[PDB]
Design a protein around this motif. Structure first.
Motif, PDB file in Angstrom:
ATOM      1  N   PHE A   1     -10.984  -9.556  39.897  1.00 12.75           N
ATOM      2  CA  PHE A   1      -9.599  -9.959  39.667  1.00 12.75           C
ATOM      3  C   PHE A   1      -9.222 -11.146  40.540  1.00 12.75           C
ATOM      4  O   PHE A   1      -8.540 -12.071  40.083  1.00 12.75           O
ATOM      5  CB  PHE A   1      -8.650  -8.790  39.922  1.00 12.75           C
ATOM      6  N   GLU A   2      -9.674 -11.151  41.795  1.00 13.88           N
ATOM      7  CA  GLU A   2      -9.327 -12.252  42.687  1.00 13.88           C
ATOM      8  C   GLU A   2     -10.118 -13.510  42.351  1.00 13.88           C
ATOM      9  O   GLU A   2      -9.544 -14.596  42.211  1.00 13.88           O
ATOM     10  CB  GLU A   2      -9.553 -11.839  44.140  1.00 13.88           C
ATOM     11  N   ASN A   3     -11.440 -13.386  42.213  1.00 18.08           N
ATOM     12  CA  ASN A   3     -12.270 -14.573  42.043  1.00 18.08           C
ATOM     13  C   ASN A   3     -12.340 -15.023  40.587  1.00 18.08           C
ATOM     14  O   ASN A   3     -12.232 -16.220  40.300  1.00 18.08           O
ATOM     15  CB  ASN A   3     -13.671 -14.312  42.594  1.00 18.08           C
TER      16      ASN A   3
ATOM     17  N   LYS B   1     -11.143 -20.012  50.188  1.00 21.40           N
ATOM     18  CA  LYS B   1     -10.338 -18.804  50.357  1.00 21.40           C
ATOM     19  C   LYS B   1     -10.654 -17.723  49.326  1.00 21.40           C
ATOM     20  O   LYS B   1     -11.542 -16.920  49.561  1.00 21.40           O
ATOM     21  CB  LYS B   1      -8.846 -19.173  50.334  1.00 21.40           C
ATOM     22  N   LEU B   2      -9.976 -17.697  48.185  1.00 19.05           N
ATOM     23  CA  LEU B   2     -10.580 -17.231  46.947  1.00 19.05           C
ATOM     24  C   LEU B   2      -9.913 -18.146  45.945  1.00 19.05           C
ATOM     25  O   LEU B   2      -8.780 -17.851  45.532  1.00 19.05           O
ATOM     26  CB  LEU B   2     -10.154 -15.775  46.678  1.00 19.05           C
TER      27      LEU B   2
ATOM     28  N   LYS C   1      -1.310 -16.581  47.812  1.00 17.40           N
ATOM     29  CA  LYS C   1      -0.859 -15.822  48.983  1.00 17.40           C
ATOM     30  C   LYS C   1      -0.611 -16.716  50.209  1.00 17.40           C
ATOM     31  O   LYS C   1       0.115 -16.342  51.135  1.00 17.40           O
ATOM     32  CB  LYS C   1      -1.866 -14.721  49.313  1.00 17.40           C
TER      33      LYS C   1
ATOM     34  N   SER D   1     -18.891 -22.051  52.667  1.00 15.19           N
ATOM     35  CA  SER D   1     -18.198 -20.807  52.983  1.00 15.19           C
ATOM     36  C   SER D   1     -17.194 -20.443  51.892  1.00 15.19           C
ATOM     37  O   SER D   1     -15.984 -20.606  52.061  1.00 15.19           O
ATOM     38  CB  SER D   1     -17.495 -20.915  54.337  1.00 15.19           C
ATOM     39  N   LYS D   2     -17.711 -19.950  50.776  1.00 22.15           N
ATOM     40  CA  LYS D   2     -16.905 -19.516  49.644  1.00 22.15           C
ATOM     41  C   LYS D   2     -16.617 -18.025  49.754  1.00 22.15           C
ATOM     42  O   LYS D   2     -17.218 -17.325  50.572  1.00 22.15           O
ATOM     43  CB  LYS D   2     -17.631 -19.859  48.345  1.00 22.15           C
ATOM     44  N   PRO D   3     -15.682 -17.502  48.955  1.00 25.75           N
ATOM     45  CA  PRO D   3     -15.372 -16.067  49.026  1.00 25.75           C
ATOM     46  C   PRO D   3     -16.602 -15.202  48.783  1.00 25.75           C
ATOM     47  O   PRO D   3     -17.343 -15.398  47.818  1.00 25.75           O
ATOM     48  CB  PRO D   3     -14.318 -15.873  47.925  1.00 25.75           C
TER      49      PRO D   3
ATOM     50  N   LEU E   1     -20.377 -16.361  44.705  1.00 25.74           N
ATOM     51  CA  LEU E   1     -20.267 -17.354  43.646  1.00 25.74           C
ATOM     52  C   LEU E   1     -21.314 -18.432  43.875  1.00 25.74           C
ATOM     53  O   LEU E   1     -21.492 -18.894  45.006  1.00 25.74           O
ATOM     54  CB  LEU E   1     -18.870 -17.987  43.612  1.00 25.74           C
TER      55      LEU E   1
ATOM     56  N   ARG F   1      -6.307 -16.641  43.708  1.00 27.00           N
ATOM     57  CA  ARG F   1      -5.571 -15.493  44.269  1.00 27.00           C
ATOM     58  C   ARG F   1      -5.188 -15.703  45.719  1.00 27.00           C
ATOM     59  O   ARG F   1      -4.189 -15.167  46.207  1.00 27.00           O
ATOM     60  CB  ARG F   1      -6.391 -14.213  44.185  1.00 27.00           C
TER      61      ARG F   1
END
Lengths: 126, 123, 126, 126, 123, 126, 293, 123, 122, 122, 128, 123, 128
Positions: B55-57, G40-41, G48, D61-63, D92, G44
């Protein structure tokens, strides 16, 4: 205590599949059971007529079955669901030891005081 | 009449996933929800923490084929169906994917929630 | 001296596996032994039931030579130790054709009641 | 209580690796730390020089979301412990396209002068 | 004149391997002999214990191409060459294999012995 | 003490290759040096003219080199041989961290009080 | 871009992005800078970001860290709110040699002060918890300051909605666990689980099975186990029942919780007996949640 | 009304294939019947001359999933279904194969006959 | 004679597909039309909601080979043919694809309509 | 005229290979004959010790295509041709293989002999 | 038809191939006949000895059933003494095991009448 | 005597290829020169018409290994060698390619000319 | 003489293909010409519209150098008004990048003279 019953009937089911006992398998399955399984080629098959073929033809080579990390969801006193990982150590045509993993979901429903599979879902290698 | 309730909450679920609405998705799922899915790589994941990442990515058209429903009382149900997904890759070409889905719904305090789900095929 | 003691129980372990002697293999292993190995397909296996299938079937027997390379021992008090090494196995497949295979093995030993027992072990590429 | 202590230092380890903080990673690791990992190509690596290349380059540095599955802890006296678990990483690649990867990890902790340090660790399938 | 000595002990070595004579092979090798070879799977093996498996367990024609010799005094030499092997598989068809070989000879007590050897290619 | 000298000149050689310093490389190599290497496609090449091409064209991306398990054979006071495993952590075109193994043999000969390579043999991935 | 020139950077404060102390060169003053890496993402997160930055531009309370600017650089973003070195509150309290009902009332008062402010500003924090509660300085009389994050939100007047499932399992109200619309109240319920730890030094709800913890939290199952609660003023226990009310519409508002002073008047009238045992348990719980959380 | 009437002649077709009875298959097919099938290699083959080779040269279990019947008046029908076949390979191993089949039936002189056949994509 | 009418509505169908005209396609298809095609991944799709997605999404050339028409009365027919398609792939190299198509036409309310169609290949 | 002599000694060569007659082959080859061939794995093999192994080791058919002969004086020539070979593989299925062969003939002591030969393919 | 004549001699050719009758095939082929086929590996073979190998070894041994289908024959007439037929040849056969297999081959046969009899002067095959 | 004389015209050939000078290459080749090479796809191509395309459309380093020269009288020679080429691919990555080359030289009017060329098996 | 005529019109055909000249190619081809080629995917295409796609898109755009070689041409004469040529076509070209590539294609061209002009009634290509 309520989950131990589901463990019992599930182990009896896997024992029936391992020993190729199709009559005991039919007793523990609802006549209108549905199944997703790799042998169905992404299709949903209904009834036990599709598994009989595997009971007759495919099933005296030594085979060992291991049940890893079972999880049981109780949904009343007549319905339960169990999901687990199934490992199978066997021998191929060359006699070499082999192993296969399979993710399995069993949906149990208590009818006439007897748990029966209404639907199951297997994935991974068959 | 009851089957259409499971179908209704299921369609609300799929749309809650397609829009990226993790709030309504969390409301429709049990906190101890377990999941089998190709994203879990053969493992069994518990809770909704594993699904938040998506959902976030993370132009899509979803189709449901041959839904079967098993009622197990007035507080437990289980629906199985085929899920076809028509989408576009970064190459721009329309692609189609199939995934067989199984949802296990349980009515708790007058509301259906997913306790466990099992998907196969499209990762 | 203690390092050598670990080497002793480890050599006895390898010899027990090679001879297919599950009896001696049971004594050197904790009943709740933890295991990571390619035969478990990325899963964590507890107990000795899983390796029994390989002791019964395969190892019960053509010429096979094992070779241990670069052993390292970590001593963690009087009652705990850990050894890591490279195992190379020379064997024959069907009509040899001599073959060789590499694996990277970690054993975690723990002295319980004056006897070293494996509490967990890890294997790679086998 | 002690099991939970191991869980604490382990979570701090995973967070230190994720943040790319080689400073905190050095404190929790023994200077002569032993390592088996796919980045070593079947070889045994000693020290922290080898992982420094991954702390400097990639992780600075990705999520990314980590998930620990089925942790098991063996306590071997007051000063020694060993934890084994399954690490699943969601990430990702280039233009995600969300991806997921599995690895099986073993950490061998040893309290030296009132501080848990890794003396050896083992990783598979990463 | 000295190069032919290394060539002589080398041919005696290859024939000692082809006949399966582990005795003469052991006499021509140092006890601390180290080896790189495809059978070692990228590892460095020490001693002759690793090579015994082959003499014990294991129509061949061997050919040596372009031998080069490096003399490093009157007690040390190093020969490198191409080794072609014409053999027959169980299928019966003639097969050919190539392996580049490096031998490091050291004269000890008036006798050349292999201290280390490095082979690449044919496993 | 005699092996430490070989370690020194070998590390200087690998430093010259890593930094792309071809002049220092030519000083530490005999003019009639022979080499077996994967870049030679199974052929034996003589002289330094074949390696110059790699010094000029191929060689500012971060690269780390690790030397595992060296073994030194002393053959008098003027000839020595060293064999070791070489690991290389680097970055590809995509910036992804990568690693490569290579088995290497160096044949040193002391001429005019200066060690020089007369022949070397590299295998594995280039 | 601009934070490069005006500001100088110093030691880290915390991590998650990284907090770091800095000082403005031009008009010399210290602040604390959130360094939010450009990774960050995707979306989403960025959402924020601006939400947190907006909320904090709006929230100016003496008991809440106030922001100054938010600067966007090339490979980073910076958020500069107000700086502190105080340690955590649940950490300072254990260090206290006299802890009483009257120190706890002094806390919940300042707390309810930051809360009320924003509830008046049409914003709900949703994540209220020991971690988020900090001390301005270690200097005497330092103030409790609410930590604005980040599962935060802007309500319309008093309108209740479904803002999605957020916060910490122990700090979650039932209206949110029931998946019902909510609002400002879900903040009051936290305070109530907070006060209860702010007295006896253990939480009202918990279970290892989180399915069970939630059931308690949905069932309002808490009780005042003797002896430790026997020495506690019935006023204390009264507020606790008013916050810990299952029905949010019946739940004491923040405005109401300030006027009823088992805090302000028991500051005037309550039990001061230093409860050393509570304080100890407290400290233990803290360490656990730090390692367990 | 006639859906069961179509299922009857369809079942008789399946029986004619199972028994290898090529005469009954000839009675149920139009002389100029066309067929797309994987054995035709993408070519449009006409007549029963192509299927003959299989009726003169041939333990299995067949399952029909999701049958759909299209009634087109009082002289034309068209049935489509998914055919799953479980069989034993030369290895003696259980195997399964999926096909998608479309039969076009025409009524002439009070009998249903196959005028076109289309299968994909397993033999 | 009535074969070029099946050919006519078939050409209007293919042209409606090439122009991306969902409006005409819907008119040419029965609402409960069933379809087998590679895009359906072996499943039977009913209606036109599945085919809609393929109308939202340069020069191509279509060639129809060996068309065979089966006439079944005066209100139903079925045409089967091979469809070759020459196109260009991003890099611009000319490509060609083969398909085996079967259309089932039925005349209801005085208009030919597809009730079911079956495709193999691309 | 002198082309069919190169063809003659070449046919005696190929026939000597097919019959496994090492005795005649040695006569037709110079002792220091060099060879490039797939069996040599890219290396240059000198002499006949390498070709001996392939004489110790059912119906095959050889067809020579597009033979070209270069005459260089009166004591040296060079013939290049394509050699197709039909055979059977254990299971007995007919197979065919292509080779590109170059023979270099030289007349010493009144006899044509191969000094070097080059082969590509099988 | 003349079209029927060319189809007749073509079906007689394929019949001679299916039965391994090298005599009839030789009578229907010109001595200087050229050929392109996958068995020639992209080369142009001339004569009949190249096909004789397959007549003697492969096709003479066939006792298994083989059924040939000629799909979409096209005939070009080029005067009274020349013709050219092109067709898709589909072969249903039994492999090594008892499993039915199908093979496709695009075939071009060039017919020329000499001495009052049609003969192949050239053919071209594709696919296997 | 003439081995160096062959090496001279061979080197001039290499220089004509390196400089892309097709005229000098024409002077050193017989008008009816034949060539086997991987670019010929197994076909025997005659003349310089085939190599022309490369002289009109083309950082590397070339190495010659194991040269063998066959002197066949006072008007014919034949040289064979292994050619190793180091180059940079489109990725900018160092690559190496091996070829086996055979040149057949004929003397006419006091000049050496290529009458046949044979390369394998890298372009 | 006639062999030279057929080679002339064949080289004019290949010249029209190399230059993307659809006009000349149309003049040298019969309207009812049939074709077997890898672009047809084992089908027998008839006419010229199938090749028109490649003339318009692929071959009209070519500004890169392309060199064609006709290896081993064989000609069968079948009366005064018919002929058949078979040859190996080798194409040297430059790919997407600047790398020289080579392609082989076995080609059979069937020529028939109508209205005093040779025209292709059928051709057959193999390889890519």
């Amino acid at each position: 205590v309520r989950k131990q019953e589901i463990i019992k009937v599930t182990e009896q089911l896997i024992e029936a599949i391992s020993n190729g006992d199709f009559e005991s398998y039919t007793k523990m399955c609802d006549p209108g059971m549905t199944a997703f399984e790799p042998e169905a080629l992404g299709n949903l098959v209904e009834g036990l007529d599709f598994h009989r073929f595997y009971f007759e033809n495919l099933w005296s080579k030594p085979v060992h079955t291991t049940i890893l990390n079972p999880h049981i969801h109780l949904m009343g006193d007549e319905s339960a669901c169990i999901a687990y990982i199934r490992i199978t150590q066997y021998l191929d045509a060359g006699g070499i030891p082999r192993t296969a993993q399979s993710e399995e979901t069993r949906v149990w429903h208590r009818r006439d005081g007897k748990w029966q599979i209404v639907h199951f879902h297997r994935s991974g290698a068959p």
